[PDB]
């Protein structure tokens, strides 16, 4: 009863078929695993330029 079961922009066929952006990890082909990016940012250095 839903175009997109997982809720992500890709419909159940799309996920099941594997016919989308192929870079997506393969488990997200399951219509219950959200094809969904989780992006955090890491610090490595800090520069203090006195004015």
């Amino acid at each position: 009863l839903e175009s997109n079961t997982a809720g992500d922009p890709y419909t159940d066929y799309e996920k099941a078929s594997g016919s989308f952006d192929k870079a997506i990890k393969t488990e997200a082909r399951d219509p219950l695993v959200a094809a969904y990016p989780i992006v955090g940012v890491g610090m490595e250095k800090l520069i203090i330029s006195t004015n």
Partner: protein, 51 residues
């Protein structure tokens, strides 16, 4: 180890076309100039005093 800045070059240092195996500037010229840092090509790339 640190990073002075990051320049997504603007329209001046841009490259119109680049055939495979070619270069920009092409084989005959001298290298071009990346002079600035922001999206309008007005302000040159700065550094610290102790830098």
């Amino acid at each position: 180890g640190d990073t002075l800045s990051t320049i997504k070059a603007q329209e001046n240092q841009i490259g119109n076309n680049l055939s495979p195996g070619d270069t920009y500037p092409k084989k005959g010229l001298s290298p071009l100039a990346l002079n600035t840092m922001d999206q309008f090509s007005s302000r040159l790339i700065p550094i610290n005093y102790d830098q």
